Symmetry: D2
Subunit: 237 residues, 4 copies
């Protein structure tokens, strides 16, 4: 299978209907061993067991350096390597520009942007030592088109910041064969907007998961710094 013998760590994959869980399932179907990292230990463990045999569920706030370090250490002690990192953890808030408070900014930016940085920092050393890896970051069409879907401007900023971080890490670690790419999903299921989608439907969690599979697998071995749109034509540019 596409991820035969690979180990993948996916943040925010404990929710049954989320993109993270759909990615964990498709990754497990493709032969990978999956480490689910989310906020609730019991939920993460149960999600890992549902995948099958040989998976792991850990608890960590991706914005907490200490908790991330403990989770990555436990994963490396058991699997010895992390080939793939899916920075899927993220939150949104439908609050407009003038209503964004300091705590709203901090919460939204911490999960997506700071969390992608902290998790990447924790996994990159092992990837560099093991000869490379693949990091997938979750952005949003809102980062490209300027919101207008659900998340507020601080969400658009956070997901745009993820793109800048991912591109910068792609350039820094290209020589180490650590590929860093980003997904920009459109409106995913996890009327007026539907009319603006050429393919005439909303996205599925499995659609984003399949894009993550492509970027995590050797089918994309020559891709780094790429922003892969998964929006059904909602944004053609």
């Amino acid at each position: 299978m596409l991820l035969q013998g690979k180990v993948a760590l996916i943040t925010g994959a404990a929710s049954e209907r989320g993109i993270g869980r759909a990615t964990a399932e498709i990754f497990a179907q493709q032969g990978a061993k999956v480490i689910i990292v989310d906020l609730d230990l019991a939920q993460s463990q149960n999600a890992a067991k549902a995948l099958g045999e040989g998976h792991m569920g850990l608890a960590a706030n991706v914005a907490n350096e200490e908790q991330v370090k403990a989770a990555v250490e436990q994963a490396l002690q058991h699997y010895g390597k992390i080939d793939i990192l899916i920075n899927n953890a993220g939150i949104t808030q439908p609050i407009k520009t003038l209503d964004i408070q300091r705590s709203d900014y901090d919460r939204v930016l911490d999960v997506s942007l700071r969390g992608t940085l902290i998790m990447s920092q924790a996994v990159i050393p092992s990837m560099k030592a093991n000869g490379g890896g693949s990091i997938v970051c979750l952005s949003s069409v809102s980062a490209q088109r300027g919101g207008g879907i659900f998340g507020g401007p601080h969400y658009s900023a956070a997901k745009a910041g993820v793109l800048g971080l991912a591109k910068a890490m792609a350039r820094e670690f290209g020589g180490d064969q650590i590929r860093v790419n980003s997904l920009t999903p459109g409106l995913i299921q996890t009327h007026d907007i539907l009319a603006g989608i050429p393919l005439g439907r909303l996205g599925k969690a499995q659609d984003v998961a399949n894009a993550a599979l492509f970027l995590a697998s050797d089918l994309s071995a020559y891709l780094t710094g790429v922003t892969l749109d998964v929006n059904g034509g909602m944004l053609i540019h």
Copy 2:
């Protein structure tokens, strides 16, 4: 078998070490029946038989409307449908702006741009009747960064026109479930002895040239159901040569 039961037509796939042939091989390995369309009938037939059994090789100049329509008819009569179209046919020319003659412009634009339009026009009616399809167009990083690799400005222009055409067809036929996406390969190892290679390679973060199989795997993604929600996309395959 990502392409099980699918039928794929690939233009310019008769060359031994080209992207088209690499795409045909990977597509066949994934369960697809492949129709190779190139300039030489014997070369196209031999390439198809090299893939395995049940494939087809046809001869047509993608810039010749009547030749394309004849080849597409022959493919539809045998297979009954075309699920995937890979507009891979293309030529390049390393001449600079002031040296581009009318015949140079015509030759380069005809294979890439007019050919992509003519082949897409010939296949789209059957795709609409069959409920959808996937069209992959071959562009180039030169269309995005303004050349500087090998092909001259008319090559950059032709491959940029392909992107405009692809996105326009993506929008027009989205309701018909005909996905149209483009590949923008970087410097790919095909048929590196000049000092200018060091500078180009130094600008590739992954530190190597691309391989035909790299572009073929991206075409496989766009041709398969793994990209069912992607249309109008431009997918860079350049090793980080252009991050934007």
Copy 3:
């Protein structure tokens, strides 16, 4: 006087309501001498005369190498230099993918893409000898978002090809200080509802963007695609 002492050649600027004429008018107001190149000699001469004094109107099909060479030579003979080239000439057709014929493809591609190449080829030698210049190419939002406004897919392809050509010429001639940039105008006078600024574009809006790219205010810009679409496409 952002274009004081400058000489600018603008193709397709003979129509009274077009972007080309609006650009010529604003360029003349900013101190430039303008050479209008269009299909009809009398219409081009009258348009140039309407700008004021010291301007010139010439006739040439931008897709005709011989006619372009004659026009540029006449312009250089009189002005001695061409500081700015505005490749504004272009045509559109609202025909869909399956209805595009060979003649439709050729006509639309010839004016925008081949015309931009032929005119640029004819002016670049003098710009190299004169220490640089500014070339502005007219693309379209349709080249970026995939049509859906008016022009058909061959128009989107032609205007996308212009962007690729402009970027390639920008890279080749950067060392000659020949800046090459492109404009991607939106809907210029249902679509209105998808425009955040709540109005259609004006010919003067595109002309003002061309003025910026033609002037020294953009001395460090080359290979740029400048959107003038009122927010119709944010990306």
Copy 4:
């Protein structure tokens, strides 16, 4: 006089040779009254007095909501309007991915991203009441190409976040005629510099005046139909 009768607030314009000061000078030459907002009151007042007559210098940390509110209150009390906002304040740090600490992330993100949000939040209400305005945000080519110039990944991330924020505000306030656009400057004025210079088609580094002239375009009526735009000022360093 492209900015005749306009009032422009420029953050981080107190440094002598910075982009902000160059923008203030060009804006003043074009008829605008400029409000310089920087960290030090004395430096800001002196910079404003150097522009000419009728200008104002204020002290505020763009990442401090109450200081920004006080400075904008004082500017609006004197001028009665703010037509233009240039979110130029920003800092950079040349540290690599694995060396970015929490304090580094906070410092860089606070000035560029949080500061742009806080200052825009403070000025937008008056722009809505005055019938429109123009907001120019300062990003960087590093946000587009993934660093490799000087600022580390957290700088690339902060300036990329500025682009996302600017586009989102452009879409939200288009109906209020508040245009929001971004500048992405390249390398603006030894081995690293020489190598970068070799990848610049125009063959030179940018000048503060080059970016100021682009800000003038976006602030003036010459760009009245532009919103949500990212305007590259990089001499061809990044063509895309």
